[PDB]
Point group: C2
Chain length 460, copies 2
């Protein structure tokens, strides 16, 4: 007899990814700690400027992080105190009673969501349609009834919550900042809905932490910006609206990554002591026994300590992003509007977006990855640009001219052109209301001395 | 509304390290530390992206190439950790083949159990290392039904070893894929540390060195390690780093690379962490004295415990489980060892092992010299007297347990023979020393 043809199945599936052009080719990119934001390709001599990297504050190369790794390597080796220090800093950042570190936030999401579903079998999960793959996977592994609500539609969310008695356990799983379009959730309104319908909230701040709030604790902290800034590390007595509890205090579970802004690898959840011990006790034991090396944790800890007391990292990134956005607006470069740090440039065609990404790196030595289906809906294909404190106006100008040339060379649609067909995603749409940038001019003018002195080198 | 806090409350209500995960003591080795220091200075700390965005680089390409070279496989893929690797591969197998039938050894560790659950396919658990029942389970299906046999090379709690060749024979006959977890093997077995699969043809691999041998140890066409369809391992134990990987055909690697969300959607491991692992893999490949050292240190302890009647569960591997038989006494022996004797050994209890089998797990390394073993040996002997713990003769009077004091029990012979323990680094093929390992295309994607 003959066995199942395994290689045939694998071949047919990989061939489909070749047909639809979703088969992926990784670019060799070696980021230079000394030359940030430069990187070199397989040949060290060929250098490019990285505009798509997710290291938002450039802390991957920062002296206090590199020194933390070097000194921690000498003492601990490569592969305890370092875990408690890191977990204590993360709990401090979010002003939560505790935090739990995992190998990655992908794991953190999968583990927490899975555990909530296993322990409450009646649980009903309400999930934003744009939630990250890790959260989709965790919700699946939770093996409970779920409802996907249209992106950031709070109207639809409420009617889904209404269909249940309040006594039914519920979880609302969403993100603060969604990276592909740079949209932002309304966290206070979701907290209000949670209180009304008796639901826990699960918030993924991965693209927020370090970039938002006075100390970079994320959008939940930005929600009461003045209350947190005044109180510093301490919990404020009242919120920005005068109430008893802050939004960040009202969210039950906050997950983040160490791999993005914090210039490291890892993931965590911050929540109340009861929740942390619950996860710590009943989650699969092997995600705790196998974890990050101490040198990696020390680096992330240093980055968190540094970024909490330096707001200039956030005001620097925001200013550089605005610079790029304003320039593109004057040139008719179709940026998808959003009140965040992300600069998605709308293309609208998958083939053209690839060609634009290729021309940018080969002709102009600019690295920007193109975004197409499945990651985005067909026809919405875009170039995702992510400014950092390290992209100074001089580098931005080069990017701006290079993008403008690519648009001319490929005759790609401008803002003017998208309007002619009615507009897309707020680009060229008559009477479209754009949300104001989360960072207000008042907040962008703040400096590090405006932060409470208790955030600088506190004992933790 | 619903009471969450009530439910949570209801459920809730200098030393010498002998239990460590770093088997070759390479985590602090100079060549690993030097690779990290140098990679840090050049690359910084984190990768700054995923493999698709900004997170694909030279240290990744070198690591995956070195792993594929170690296992003599067309390709290898690195994951955040070992449990991510197992969960990714197993999940995708069950996702893409929904009819697949998984045959799992009863002692597979939680990571494999979780991965098989996430595969969401029919499964059969066969008694540990029972290949008669496995063959009976495989024969009850036509050959055409896709099957996966999932097992480990070394089971870490009792130190027993699977027969990999025989399972491959069963997989060829009944038309099944094999998924082998070498996490507790790689670096410790085979001439070059490629694991038990390499040890299965020890002399063919030692002769050929880096190269694929033309025949196996029996004269046949394919080595055991070549016949295994998927080999998973960790960078977190013998290689003194963090991470996980699978080694397989380039088509399988491209499949995981393309379809596995746990590979795609997470940040790439720091470049320095990868350089560190690569340095360890290269050093350990061409130093067999690390493996002979660990085996001799493990055997030294076992012999001394034997002459003292300390009840070690017999195994042909690097592990020294010490049978206690009671959970509270095992914890109490561990507490005494660390507080009184400054010896750290963690007690292993239920669920990990069956109640009444509770034990102390000891993992010697090349860094445990006989002088350190002597301190361990004397401390355990004292603790056994202080707590009145049963000795071998005592287990012998009760009929024996797990091969301790069992009448007419023949112990499995060590995987490392006397001939193999006599080898030195000069007995390895020179081509494993300072080899030039070319990067792999499948790591970046294949062009057609």
């Amino acid at each position: 007899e003959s066995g199942f043809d395994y290689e045939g199945l694998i071949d047919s599936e990989l061939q489909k990814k070749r047909l639809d052009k979703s088969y992926r080719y990784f670019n060799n990119i070696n980021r230079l700690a000394k030359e940030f934001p430069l990187a070199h390709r397989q040949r060290e001599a060929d250098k490019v400027t990285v505009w798509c990297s997710n290291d938002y504050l450039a802390l991957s190369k920062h002296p206090e992080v590199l020194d933390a790794m070097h000194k921690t390597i000498d003492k601990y080796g490569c592969g305890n105190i370092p875990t408690l220090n890191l977990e204590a800093e993360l709990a401090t950042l979010h002003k939560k009673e505790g935090a739990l570190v995992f190998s990655s936030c992908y794991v953190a999401n999968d583990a927490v969501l899975s555990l909530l579903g296993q322990k409450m079998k009646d649980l009903v999960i309400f999930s934003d349609e744009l939630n990250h793959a890790s959260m989709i996977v965790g919700i699946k592994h939770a093996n409970v009834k779920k409802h996907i609500f249209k992106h950031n539609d709070l109207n639809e969310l409420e009617q889904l919550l209404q269909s249940y008695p309040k006594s039914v356990p519920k979880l609302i799983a969403f993100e603060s900042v969604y990276s592909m379009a740079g949209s932002v959730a309304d966290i206070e309104k979701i907290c209000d809905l949670a209180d009304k319908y008796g639901a826990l909230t699960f918030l993924d701040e991965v693209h927020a932490v370090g970039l938002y709030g006075p100390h970079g604790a994320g959008v939940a902290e930005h929600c009461d910006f003045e209350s947190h800034r005044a109180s510093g590390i301490a919990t404020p007595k009242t919120n920005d609206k005068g109430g008893a509890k802050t939004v960040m205090d009202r969210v039950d579970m906050i997950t983040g990554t160490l791999g993005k802004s914090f210039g490291s690898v890892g993931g965590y959840v911050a929540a109340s002591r009861k929740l942390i011990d619950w996860f710590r006790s009943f989650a699969p034991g092997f995600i705790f026994t196998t974890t990050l090396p101490p040198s990696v944790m020390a680096g992330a800890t240093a980055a968190i300590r540094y970024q909490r007391c330096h707001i200039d990292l956030r005001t620097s990134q925001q200013k550089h992003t605005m610079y790029v956005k304003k320039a593109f607006h004057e040139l008719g470069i179709p940026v998808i509007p959003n009140p965040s740090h992300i600069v998605p440039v709308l293309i609208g065609n998958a083939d053209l977006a690839k060609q634009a990404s290729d021309i940018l790196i080969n002709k102009h030595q600019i690295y920007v990855q193109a975004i197409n289906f499945p990651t985005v809906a067909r026809g919405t294909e875009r170039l995702r640009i992510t400014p950092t404190p390290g992209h100074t106006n001089d580098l931005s100008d080069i990017l701006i001219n290079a993008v403008d040339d690519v648009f001319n060379e490929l005759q790609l649609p401008r803002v003017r052109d998208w309007e002619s067909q009615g507009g897309l995603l707020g680009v060229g749409e008559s009477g479209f209301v754009e949300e104001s940038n989360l960072w207000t001019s008042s907040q962008l003018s703040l400096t590090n001395d405006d932060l409470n002195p208790n955030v600088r080198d506190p004992i933790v």
